[PDB]
Every structure is written in C-alpha cells, then in structure tokens.
Short mmCIF file of C-alpha atoms and ligand atoms in Angstrom, two decimals:
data_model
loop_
_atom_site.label_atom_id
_atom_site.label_comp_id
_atom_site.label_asym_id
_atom_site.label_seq_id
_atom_site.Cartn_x
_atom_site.Cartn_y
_atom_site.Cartn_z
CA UNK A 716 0.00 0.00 0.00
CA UNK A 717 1.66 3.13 -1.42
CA UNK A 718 0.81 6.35 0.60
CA UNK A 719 -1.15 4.53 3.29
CA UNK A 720 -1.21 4.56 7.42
CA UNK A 721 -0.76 1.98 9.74
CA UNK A 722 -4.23 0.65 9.76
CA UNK A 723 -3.83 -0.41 13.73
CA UNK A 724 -4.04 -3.89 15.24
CA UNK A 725 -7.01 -5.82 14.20
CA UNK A 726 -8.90 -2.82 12.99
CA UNK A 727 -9.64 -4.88 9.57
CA UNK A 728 -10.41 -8.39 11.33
CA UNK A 729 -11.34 -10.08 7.92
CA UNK A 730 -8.22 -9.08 6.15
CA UNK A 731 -6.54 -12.54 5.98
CA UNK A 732 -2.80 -13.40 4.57
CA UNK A 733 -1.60 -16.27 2.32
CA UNK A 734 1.23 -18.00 3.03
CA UNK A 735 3.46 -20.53 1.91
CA UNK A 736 6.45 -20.38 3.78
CA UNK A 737 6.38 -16.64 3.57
CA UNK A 738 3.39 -13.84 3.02
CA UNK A 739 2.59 -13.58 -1.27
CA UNK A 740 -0.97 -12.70 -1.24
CA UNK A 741 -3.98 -10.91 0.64
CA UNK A 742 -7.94 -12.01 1.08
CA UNK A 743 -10.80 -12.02 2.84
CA UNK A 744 -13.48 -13.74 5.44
CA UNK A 745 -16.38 -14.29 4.04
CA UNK A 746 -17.58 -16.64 6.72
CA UNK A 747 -15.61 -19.01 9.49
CA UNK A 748 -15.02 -22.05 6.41
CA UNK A 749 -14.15 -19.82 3.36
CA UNK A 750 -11.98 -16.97 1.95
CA UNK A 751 -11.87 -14.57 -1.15
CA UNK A 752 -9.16 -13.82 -2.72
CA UNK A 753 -7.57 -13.03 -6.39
CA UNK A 754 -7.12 -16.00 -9.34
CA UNK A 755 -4.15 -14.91 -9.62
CA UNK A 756 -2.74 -15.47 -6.01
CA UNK A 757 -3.70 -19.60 -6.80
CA UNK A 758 -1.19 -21.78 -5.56
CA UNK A 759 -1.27 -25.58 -3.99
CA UNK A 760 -0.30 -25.81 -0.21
CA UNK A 761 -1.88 -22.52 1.29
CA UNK A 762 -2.00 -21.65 4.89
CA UNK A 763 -4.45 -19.16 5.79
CA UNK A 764 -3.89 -16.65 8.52
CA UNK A 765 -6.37 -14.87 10.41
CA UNK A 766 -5.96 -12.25 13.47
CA UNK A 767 -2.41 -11.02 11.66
CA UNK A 768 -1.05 -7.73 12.68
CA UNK A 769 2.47 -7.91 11.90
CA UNK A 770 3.17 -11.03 10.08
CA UNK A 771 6.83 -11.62 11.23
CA UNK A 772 5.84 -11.29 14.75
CA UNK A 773 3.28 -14.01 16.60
CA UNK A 774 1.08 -11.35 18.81
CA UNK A 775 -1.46 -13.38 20.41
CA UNK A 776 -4.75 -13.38 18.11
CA UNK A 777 -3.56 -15.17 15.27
CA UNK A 778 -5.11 -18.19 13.84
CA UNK A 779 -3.20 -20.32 10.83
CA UNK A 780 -5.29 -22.84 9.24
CA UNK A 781 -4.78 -24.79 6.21
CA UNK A 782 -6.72 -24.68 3.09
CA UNK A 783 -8.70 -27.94 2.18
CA UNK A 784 -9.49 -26.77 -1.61
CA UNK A 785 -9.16 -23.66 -3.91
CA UNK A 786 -11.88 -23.12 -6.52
CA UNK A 787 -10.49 -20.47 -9.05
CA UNK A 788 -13.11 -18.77 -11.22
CA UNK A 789 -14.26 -21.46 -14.02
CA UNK A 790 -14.04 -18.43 -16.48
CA UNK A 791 -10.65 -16.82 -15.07
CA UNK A 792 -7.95 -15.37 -17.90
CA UNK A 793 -4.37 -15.26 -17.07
CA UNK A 794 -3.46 -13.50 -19.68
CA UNK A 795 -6.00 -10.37 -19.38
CA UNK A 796 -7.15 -11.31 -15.58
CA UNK A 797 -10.59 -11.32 -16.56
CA UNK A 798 -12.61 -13.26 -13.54
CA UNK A 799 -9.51 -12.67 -11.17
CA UNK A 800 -11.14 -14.31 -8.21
CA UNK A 801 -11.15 -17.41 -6.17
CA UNK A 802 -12.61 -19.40 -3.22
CA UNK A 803 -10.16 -20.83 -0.56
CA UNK A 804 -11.87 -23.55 1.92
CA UNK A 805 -10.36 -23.53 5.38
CA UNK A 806 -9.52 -27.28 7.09
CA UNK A 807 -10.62 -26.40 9.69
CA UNK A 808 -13.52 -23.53 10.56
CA UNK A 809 -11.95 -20.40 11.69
CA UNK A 810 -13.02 -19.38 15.85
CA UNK A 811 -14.89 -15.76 15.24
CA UNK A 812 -13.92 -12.93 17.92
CA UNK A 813 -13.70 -9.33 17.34
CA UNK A 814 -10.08 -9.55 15.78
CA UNK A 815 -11.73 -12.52 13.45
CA UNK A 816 -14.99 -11.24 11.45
CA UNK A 817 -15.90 -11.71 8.57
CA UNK A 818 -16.82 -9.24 5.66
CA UNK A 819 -20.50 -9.18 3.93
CA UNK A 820 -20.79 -9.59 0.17
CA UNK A 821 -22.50 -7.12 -1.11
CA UNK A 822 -26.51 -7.33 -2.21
CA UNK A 823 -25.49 -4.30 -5.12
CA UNK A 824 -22.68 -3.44 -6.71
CA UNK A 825 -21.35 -0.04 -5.18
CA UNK A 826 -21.43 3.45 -7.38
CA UNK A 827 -18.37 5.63 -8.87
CA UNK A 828 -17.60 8.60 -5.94
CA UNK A 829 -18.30 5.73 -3.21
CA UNK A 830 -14.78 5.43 -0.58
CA UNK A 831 -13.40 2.78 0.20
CA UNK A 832 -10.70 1.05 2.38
CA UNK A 833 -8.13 -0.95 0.53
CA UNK A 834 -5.59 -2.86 2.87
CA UNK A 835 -2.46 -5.36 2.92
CA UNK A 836 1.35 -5.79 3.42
CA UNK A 837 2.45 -5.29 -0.37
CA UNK A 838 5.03 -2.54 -0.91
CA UNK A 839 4.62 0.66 0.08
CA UNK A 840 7.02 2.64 -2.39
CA UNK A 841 6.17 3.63 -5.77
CA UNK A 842 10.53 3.75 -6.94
CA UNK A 843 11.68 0.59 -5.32
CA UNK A 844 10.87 -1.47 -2.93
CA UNK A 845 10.07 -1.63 1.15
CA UNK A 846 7.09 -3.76 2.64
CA UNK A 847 5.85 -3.29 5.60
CA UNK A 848 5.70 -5.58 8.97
CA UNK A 849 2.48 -4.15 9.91
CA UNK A 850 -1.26 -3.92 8.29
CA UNK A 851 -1.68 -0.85 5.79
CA UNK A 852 -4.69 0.83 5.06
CA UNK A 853 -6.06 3.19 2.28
CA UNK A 854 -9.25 5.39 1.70
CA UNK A 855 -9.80 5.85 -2.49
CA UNK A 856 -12.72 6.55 -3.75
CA UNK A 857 -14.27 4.31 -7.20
CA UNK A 858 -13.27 6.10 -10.27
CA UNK A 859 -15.83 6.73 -13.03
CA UNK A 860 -15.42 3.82 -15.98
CA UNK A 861 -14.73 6.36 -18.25
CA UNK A 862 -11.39 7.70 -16.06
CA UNK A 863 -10.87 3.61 -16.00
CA UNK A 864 -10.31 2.70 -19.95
CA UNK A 865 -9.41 5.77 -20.38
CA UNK A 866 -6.35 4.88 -18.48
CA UNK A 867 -5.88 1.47 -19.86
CA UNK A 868 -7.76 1.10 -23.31
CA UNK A 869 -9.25 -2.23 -24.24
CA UNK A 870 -8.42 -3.93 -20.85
CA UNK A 871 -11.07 -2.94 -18.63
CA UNK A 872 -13.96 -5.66 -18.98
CA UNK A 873 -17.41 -5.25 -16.88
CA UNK A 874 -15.86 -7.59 -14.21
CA UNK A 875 -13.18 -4.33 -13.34
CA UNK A 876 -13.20 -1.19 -11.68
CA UNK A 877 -10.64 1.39 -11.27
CA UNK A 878 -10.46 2.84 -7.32
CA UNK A 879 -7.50 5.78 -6.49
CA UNK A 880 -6.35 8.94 -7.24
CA UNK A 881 -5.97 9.64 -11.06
CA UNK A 882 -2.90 12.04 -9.78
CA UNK A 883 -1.26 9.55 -8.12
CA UNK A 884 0.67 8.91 -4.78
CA UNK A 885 -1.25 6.60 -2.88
CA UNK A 886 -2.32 2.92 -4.44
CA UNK A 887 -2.24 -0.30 -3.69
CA UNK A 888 1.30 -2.83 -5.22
CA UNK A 889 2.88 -6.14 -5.14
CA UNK A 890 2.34 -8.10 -2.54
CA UNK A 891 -1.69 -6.50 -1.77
CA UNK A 892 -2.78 -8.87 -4.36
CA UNK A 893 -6.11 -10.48 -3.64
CA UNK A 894 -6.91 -8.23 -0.65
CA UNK A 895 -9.77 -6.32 0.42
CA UNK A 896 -12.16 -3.05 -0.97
CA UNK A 897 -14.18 -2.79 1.34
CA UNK A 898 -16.92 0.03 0.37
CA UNK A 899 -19.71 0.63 2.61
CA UNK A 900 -19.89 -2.61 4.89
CA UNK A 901 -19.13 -4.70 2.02
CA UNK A 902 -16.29 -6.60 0.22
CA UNK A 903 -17.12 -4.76 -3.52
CA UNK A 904 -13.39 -5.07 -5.00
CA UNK A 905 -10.19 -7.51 -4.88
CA UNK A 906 -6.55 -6.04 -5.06
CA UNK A 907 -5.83 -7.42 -9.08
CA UNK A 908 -3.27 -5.10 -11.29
CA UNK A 909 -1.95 -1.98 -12.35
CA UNK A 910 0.25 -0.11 -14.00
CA UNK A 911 3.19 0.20 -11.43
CA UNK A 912 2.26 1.57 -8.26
CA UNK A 913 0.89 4.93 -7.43
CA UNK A 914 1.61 6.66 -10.79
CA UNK A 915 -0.36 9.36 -12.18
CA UNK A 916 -3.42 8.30 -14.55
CA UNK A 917 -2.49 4.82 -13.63
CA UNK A 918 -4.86 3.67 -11.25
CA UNK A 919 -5.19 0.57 -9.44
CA UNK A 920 -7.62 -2.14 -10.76
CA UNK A 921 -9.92 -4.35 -8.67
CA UNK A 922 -12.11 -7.06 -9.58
CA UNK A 923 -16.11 -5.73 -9.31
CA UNK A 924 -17.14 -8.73 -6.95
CA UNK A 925 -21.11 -7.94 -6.62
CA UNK A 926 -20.60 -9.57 -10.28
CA UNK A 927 -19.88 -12.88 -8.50
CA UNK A 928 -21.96 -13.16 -5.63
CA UNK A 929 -24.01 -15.88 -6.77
CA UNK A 930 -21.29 -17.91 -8.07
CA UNK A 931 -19.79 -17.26 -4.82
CA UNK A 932 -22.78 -18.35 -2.93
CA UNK A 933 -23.60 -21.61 -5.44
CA UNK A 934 -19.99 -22.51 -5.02
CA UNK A 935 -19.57 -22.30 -1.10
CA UNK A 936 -22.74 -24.39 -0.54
CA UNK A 937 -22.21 -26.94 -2.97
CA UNK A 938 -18.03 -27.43 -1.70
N1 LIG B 75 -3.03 -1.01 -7.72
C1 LIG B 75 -1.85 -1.32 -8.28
N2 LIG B 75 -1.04 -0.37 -8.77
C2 LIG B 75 -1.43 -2.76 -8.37
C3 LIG B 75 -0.60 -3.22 -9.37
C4 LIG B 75 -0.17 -4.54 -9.50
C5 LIG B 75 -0.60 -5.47 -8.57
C6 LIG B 75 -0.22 -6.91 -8.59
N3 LIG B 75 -0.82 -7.57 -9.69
C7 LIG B 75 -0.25 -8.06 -10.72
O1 LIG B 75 0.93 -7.83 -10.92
C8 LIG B 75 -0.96 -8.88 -11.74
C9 LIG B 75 -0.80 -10.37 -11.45
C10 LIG B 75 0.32 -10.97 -12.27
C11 LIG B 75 0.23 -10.11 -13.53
N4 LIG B 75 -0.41 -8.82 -13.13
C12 LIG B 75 -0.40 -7.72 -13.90
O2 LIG B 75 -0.78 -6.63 -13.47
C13 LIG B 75 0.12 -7.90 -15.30
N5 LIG B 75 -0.39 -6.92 -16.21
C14 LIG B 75 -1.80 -7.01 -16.52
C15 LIG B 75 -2.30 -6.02 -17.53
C16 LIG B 75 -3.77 -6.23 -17.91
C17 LIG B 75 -3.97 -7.65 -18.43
C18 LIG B 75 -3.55 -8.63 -17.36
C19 LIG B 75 -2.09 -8.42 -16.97
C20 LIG B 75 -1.44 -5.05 -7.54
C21 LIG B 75 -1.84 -3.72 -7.45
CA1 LIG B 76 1.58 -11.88 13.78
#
C-alpha cells in the first residue's frame, strides 16, 4: 500500500494473509469455512492466517489454518485477468472474535464517488521497494469507468473497476494482491493489477465482486 497509514491492530479483522512459507498474497473472510481472494494469487499448499497484525511477529490473536481446496473462477484469464477471483476452503472452521470477522458480500454493486478502504502488506514505495511488517490501510474513492479505460484502453472488462487517485501517490502494489475493498460494509473489489504503483493516470484495478456473488454463494454451498 503506497501512501497509506498503519491501519492499527485488528482494525480490519477479515483481512486474511496467504502463506506458503512466507506472506505472497492478501484475502478475505467471508464466513468461518471460506476466503476470497484473487485468481491470480492460486497456488497448492496454502496456509491461511487470520488475526495477523504484523506477520513476522506471533502477537497473540492469530489463527493459521490450512486450506482444504481452492476453486479459481471457471471463467478466469491469465493473460488479461478477466474473472480474477477465487474461493479458498479452510480445514478447519476459523473461531470468530472481534479480531476474526468476517466481511458481507454485497446485495449491489457499489457506485463511482463511493470510498473505500483498501488494505495489505504489499510494498509501500512507488521507486523501489520496502514492505511493511504491519497492516496498511487506504481510503480511495471508485473512479468513473470512463477515467478507468481511459487509463488502460481495451483492458477494462465489466468484471473491473478502477479505485484511487488519477494524480497519483497513494495505491495499492505487489504483494496486496487479492486483498480487500471494502466500500460501505461490504467486500465490492479484490486487489488485481496496475500499471506500477501509485503513478499518475495509472490507477489501481480491482475485480467488481457484486458480479460474483451468486457464483460465490452456489460454489460455497455446494463445496
Ligand atoms: N493497484 C496497483 N497499482 C497494483 C498493481 C499490481 C498489482 C499486482 N498484480 C499483478 O501484478 C498482476 C498479477 C500478475 C500479472 N499482473 C499484472 O498486473 C500484469 N499486467 C496485466 C495487464 C492487464 C492484463 C492482465 C495483466 C497489484 C496492485
Ligand atoms: Ca503476527
């Protein structure tokens, strides 16, 4: 998170982190068996952990679980990421407190001028490279469409949105990949690409999840 703040312990208790031997990718609670995250973050052999402040130091409210199954979007494109999301089934159900919540999907999708928070431990420079120990946290606001493709023409699909500050200075990067946008009380976007980090008319990109919540819903309950 480029031009952030220190979001505070446990102030975003459904921001989860991937991890396979180290931190690669963010997501989110959805409820104590299953988390969202980005297609893009899929690899096998995922731990899941919940209650993280700073991830290289074990605070007290952490919970690491291992994933049973990943279901990545049947309709997912690597190559244009295009239906960058995926479902990530916990081994074990995840023990709810106030530092372990989930997030709501949404029952609408959310409208251009709406804030949001956007949060994670991906880098937090836009010229090289520092990440952070500690949860970051932005507020951006959803950027019209038109500001979107406009800023990257002919890959912005219906399944997109762009959220930031067209002048640049404060984004999300690397490593925030498949964390939350949370707009409203509800999980509307997933950290998914970009043009760098923070650059001017380059804004960040986020997968528009009120287009999945049925699939989301169909999936959990049949898995
Ligand atoms: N908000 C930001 N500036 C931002 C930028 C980048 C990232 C991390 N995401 C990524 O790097 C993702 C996953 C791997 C390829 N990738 C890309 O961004 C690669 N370029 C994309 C262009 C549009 C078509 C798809 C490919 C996360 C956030
Ligand atoms: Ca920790």
């Amino acid at each position: 998170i480029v031009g952030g703040y220190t979001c505070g312990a446990n102030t975003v208790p459904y921001q989860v982190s991937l991890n396979s031997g180290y931190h690669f990718c963010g997501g989110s609670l959805i409820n104590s068996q299953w988390v969202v995250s980005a297609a893009h973050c899929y690899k096998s052999g995922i731990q899941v952990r919940l209650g993280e402040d700073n991830i290289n130091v074990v605070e007290g409210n952490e919970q690491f679980i291992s994933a049973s199954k990943s279901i990545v979007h049947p309709s997912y494109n690597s190559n244009t990421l295009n239906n960058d999301i995926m479902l990530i089934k916990l081994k074990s159900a995840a023990s709810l407190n106030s530092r372990v919540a989930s997030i709501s999907l949404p029952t609408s999708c959310a409208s251009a001028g709406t804030q949001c928070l956007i949060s994670g431990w991906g880098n937090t420079k836009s010229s090289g490279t520092s990440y952070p120990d500690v949860l970051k946290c932005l507020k951006a606001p959803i950027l019209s469409d038109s500001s979107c493709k406009s800023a990257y023409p002919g890959q912005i699909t219906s399944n997109m949105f762009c959220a930031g500050y067209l002048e640049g200075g404060k984004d999300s990067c690397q490593g925030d990949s498949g964390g939350p946008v949370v707009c409203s009380g509800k999980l509307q976007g997933i950290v998914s690409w970009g043009s760098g980090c923070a650059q001017k008319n380059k804004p960040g990109v986020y997968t528009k999840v009120c287009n999945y919540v049925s699939w989301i819903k169909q999936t959990i309950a049949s898995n």
